[PDB]
């Protein structure tokens, strides 16, 4: 009664080459971690210091030279109420000001202290903060599982206001973090209808919609979509909660062009290309003007990966087996490959100022050369 | 079961039925219905189907197929046959316990089947005065009426043995309201008489006495 496996499979590992030489500078742990649960625990970075996180409890503070601690405090309540209170941290571990304003599942947003890791304040919020917090003029913001863009005063967590949205019965964990644009944030939605709001009073000015019918007619809105969109020069590229690419302005937020093909997973804007992957490991390249297939690499098809990131002329993508895959912007064969972890990769490899980093499943960091 | 176009295999069913062996023809026939839901005479097969069902004790499925043919196309030059057949199904379903061969009287068991049979035959008769199946329908009607009367009389007897002397009066009144000709009624009257006697209600007993004396 327990011998009933059946599923379609994926391309294992096409044509490993070595046009680069990938090495692992340092890999400290912070312990589990993430296990197998779905979340967004990407560790951020500033001032040559990284700040990892875990599944249940601890955070740390690791120097970005070899992974040495600055302070590794727990966050779960000391005297375990039920059992050490697994805080189930699931928010994007961002930072600003003095301060890793981590998200959580217990409806808490622990504003910590970069100095030593002493809670500047806790705060309760409607539903869980499955999204990634984002600072914007001392106003963090949180998309929830109750569609409530509850902004907060930075220094205190004084809830400035909330805004309600909708959500179907069945959804995905699509948790668009907002993006600042002249006070005008913008978010996606598990509904599938991007909005446009203002902070100071929490008021929305406009509504849209992208894809076709779903619900008992489940549409291809399932997507590793960076539900968080981007904007340039008054026009946005809200790679659809579905994935059917759309370009829109700020004020009207109207369709400029519809590359209605699949389900997005991320995007990157530079010059004219829009690198991204679509729902089936299909790394593409498209131009700003409209849906314009610059090319299409589809090697890893059906072998699911994580959202990508630019790195000094070399797109990079994670995997489900601890491999790295380095690619030139010209399509689009591999320029190298590594195998850096065993458990696997889940979250977004963030990188900046040369330092490229990523958290593993549990043995989090891998300072790639 | 092999396969062919419908004609020859339907003729084979004809053969193996007219012989007398049922189940083989049953199979061939339900087949010809299935593999050709609207074949040559796709209802002819239905009539033959119910006939075989009956002649092979397949009572419930016979019943079902009867209902299906009726509601499928009620107006039909031969439907009276189907009415009458449904009547036979009910009736034979009633006394089915052949143990009666031992000599017992079935007249005291569940009567519901008799009721359905009677309804059916009644509808047939009043719906078709001079069809081929009127008379035998009438005879069966009379016999069923008598059966029902006997049943209720049994119940009344049991109670008057028990003592419940308002149940008796009610049951006898009901019969006398519905079967006011059989032997059972002209037999049960003394029960109502005695009941009225019991509860010190006399004038009522005198009424029923005048009745019982008028026969």
């Amino acid at each position: 009664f327990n011998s009933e496996e059946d599923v379609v499979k994926m391309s294992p590992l096409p044509t490993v080459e070595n046009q680069f030489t990938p090495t692992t500078a340092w890999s400290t742990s912070v312990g589990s971690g993430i296990g197998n649960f779905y979340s967004n625990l990407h560790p951020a970075l500033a001032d040559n210091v990284v700040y990892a996180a875990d599944r249940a409890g601890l955070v740390k503070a690791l120097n970005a030279d070899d992974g040495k601690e600055i302070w590794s405090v727990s966050l779960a309540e000391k005297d375990g109420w039920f059992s050490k209170e697994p805080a189930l941290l699931s928010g994007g571990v961002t930072v600003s000001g003095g301060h890793v304003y981590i998200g959580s599942e217990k409806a808490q947003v622990y504003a910590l202290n970069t100095s030593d890791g002493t809670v500047a304040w806790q705060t309760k919020v409607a539903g869980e903060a499955l999204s990634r917090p984002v600072v914007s003029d001392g106003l963090v913001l949180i998309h929830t599982s109750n569609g409530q863009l509850q902004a907060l005063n930075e220094a205190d967590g004084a809830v400035k206001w909330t805004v309600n949205l909708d959500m179907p019965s069945l959804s995905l964990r699509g948790e668009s973090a907002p993006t600042t644009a002249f006070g005008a944030a913008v978010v996606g939605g598990d509904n599938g209808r991007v909005s446009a709001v203002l902070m100071e009073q929490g008021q929305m000015i406009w509504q849209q919609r992208i894809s076709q019918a779903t619900g008992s007619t489940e549409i291809d809105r399932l997507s590793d979509v960076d539900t968080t969109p981007v904007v340039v020069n008054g026009v946005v590229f809200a790679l659809a909660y579905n994935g059917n690419l759309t370009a829109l302005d700020l004020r009207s937020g109207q369709i400029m062009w519809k590359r209605e093909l699949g389900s997005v997973n991320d995007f990157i804007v530079d010059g004219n290309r829009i690198y991204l992957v679509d729902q089936n490991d299909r790394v593409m390249a498209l131009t700003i003007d409209g849906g314009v297939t610059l090319w299409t690499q589809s090697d890893l098809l059906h072998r699911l990966l994580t959202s990508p990131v630019l790195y000094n002329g070399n797109l990079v993508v994670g995997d489900s087996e601890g491999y790295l895959h380095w690619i030139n912007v010209e399509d689009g064969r591999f320029v190298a490959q590594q195998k850096v972890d065993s458990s696997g990769f889940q979250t977004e490899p963030v990188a900046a100022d040369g330092k490229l980093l990523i958290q593993a499943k549990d043995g989090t960091v891998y300072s790639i050369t | 079961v092999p396969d062919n176009p419908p004609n020859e295999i339907y003729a084979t069913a004809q053969q193996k039925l007219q012989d007398g062996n049922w189940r083989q023809a049953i199979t061939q026939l339900e087949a010809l219905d299935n593999r050709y839901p609207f074949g040559p005479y796709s209802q002819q097969v239905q009539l033959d189907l119910i006939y075989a069902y009956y002649k092979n004790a397949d009572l419930p499925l016979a019943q079902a197929a009867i209902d299906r043919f009726i509601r499928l196309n009620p107006t039909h030059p031969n439907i009276d046959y189907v009415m009458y057949m449904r009547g036979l199904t009910n009736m034979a379903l009633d006394d089915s316990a052949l143990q009666g061969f031992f000599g017992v009287d079935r007249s005291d068991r569940d009567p519901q089947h008799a009721r359905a049979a009677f309804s059916d035959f009644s509808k047939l008769v009043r719906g078709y005065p001079n069809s081929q199946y009127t008379t035998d329908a009438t005879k069966r009607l009379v016999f069923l009426k008598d059966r029902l009367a006997k049943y209720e009389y049994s119940v009344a007897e049991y109670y008057t043995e028990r003592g419940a002397w308002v149940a008796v009066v009610n049951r006898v009144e009901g019969m006398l309201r519905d079967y006011p000709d059989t032997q059972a009624t002209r037999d049960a009257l003394p029960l109502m008489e005695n009941a009225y006697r019991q509860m010190q209600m006399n004038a009522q007993a005198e009424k029923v006495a005048k009745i019982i004396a008028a026969n």
Partner: protein, 89 residues
Amino acid sequence: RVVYRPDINQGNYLTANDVSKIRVGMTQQQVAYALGTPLMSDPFGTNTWFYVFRQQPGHEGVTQQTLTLTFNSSGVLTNIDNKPALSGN
């Protein structure tokens, strides 16, 4: 002898107060509403009702009060008959 018997009772329950409600000149409707429905009616002859409250607890006498009120063609009431006891044992 003395073995056993479940109690025996016959319907058309009665109190000893409501039987002070019903009156002459009332309606079949009013009376039927007041005392419920007459479980044992006159099957023939004139329309007339029989409310009988008979009860046998088993091996201890048999109690029965009965009241079988009359009626009229028009469906109105004329007379009543209060039998509280059963003479004859």
